[model samples]
Target: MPHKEKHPLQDMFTSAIEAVARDSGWAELSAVGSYLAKNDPSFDPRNWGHGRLSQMVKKLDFLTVQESRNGSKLHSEIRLRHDGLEHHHHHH
Candidate 1:
């Protein structure tokens, strides 16, 4: 089977989440960089933030909908899922 068309809204949404992660200091991107570099000896978190992360987000099917295939009814519903890694599990 062929892949579905990529949507612009999804890309924007994913990048926005990543930006917010940076803003909130939740994702230890810099720390991840240092850890990886210790073994490889030449790695930078700056490279991951500015380049790699964006490329990875484009591959996700972030939005899903249950609708008739032939456009029978125009219905739209939005739901948010908190994937464990991206969400806080603290009780506080």
Candidate 2:
């Protein structure tokens, strides 16, 4: 298996973000990062050298990112981007 070690984002971050983003159409920010970290053990921010997992929020194209209130929770919540759920067309 040949994988790009330099660009872990394209190889790992991108996939994880796309996954966490495409869930529930809405999961908490905590859930998002947790999902990413839990999904992959290698997942981390020190490697990206930008910020925390939320920092990845800057690059995602398919998912619209935002910060909301979690109330009792420390952070907040956000909506994951999704498409064509209640429609008439589909494809691979």
Candidate 3:
């Protein structure tokens, strides 16, 4: 069987997440979202068939998600699994 091609935005989203992770062990969900929004104004979780960005990110095997609560609010943090050693960008 052939592998299904991923949506273009999905690819961009991963790059945005990885860029944020490169400087730290992990990044807040909002950070990744902000990065994407700045680079791609049209970024939206619904485009990837997910109701929320956190839910879509949770499905990727190469990424890890951590959640916490701040009083009555919920927060999410994300990182590249395995220290992101296997993730790379070829833009150079």
**Model 1 Cα lDDT, one tens digit per residue, 1-92:** 32221245444334333544443433233333333355334434466565454344335445332222226743222222344234344953
In angstroms, give how far residue 81 of model 1 lies from its true place.
13
List per-prediction Cα lDDT, in the order shown: 0.37, 0.52, 0.65
Count of backbone clashes, every candidate in sequence:
0, 0, 0
Stretches > 4 Å off in candidate 1? 1-27, 44-92
lDDT of 2 at 54: 59
Clashing pairs in 3: none
Q: Give candidate 3's TM-score.
A: 0.54
Q: Rank the candidates by lDDT, best first.
A: 3, 2, 1
Candidate 3 lDDT over residue span 29-88, tens digit each: 777777876666666645765437788778876767788564797778776555544545
Q: Give the C-alpha lDDT of model 3.
A: 0.65
lDDT of 3 at 65: 76
How much lDDT does candidate 1 score?
Answer: 0.37
Cα RMSD, model 1: 16.9
Best by lDDT: 3
Give the 10-residue window scoring lowest on summed lDDT in candidate 2: 1-10
TM-score of 1: 0.22
Per-residue lDDT over 1-92 for candidate 2, one digit per residue giving the tens place of the 0 to 100 score: 33322244434534544566565545566664566556654556557653355556656654456665556645534444455233344753
lDDT of 3 at 68: 59
> Could you list the CA RMSD of all candidates, in the order they appear?
16.9, 7.9, 9.8
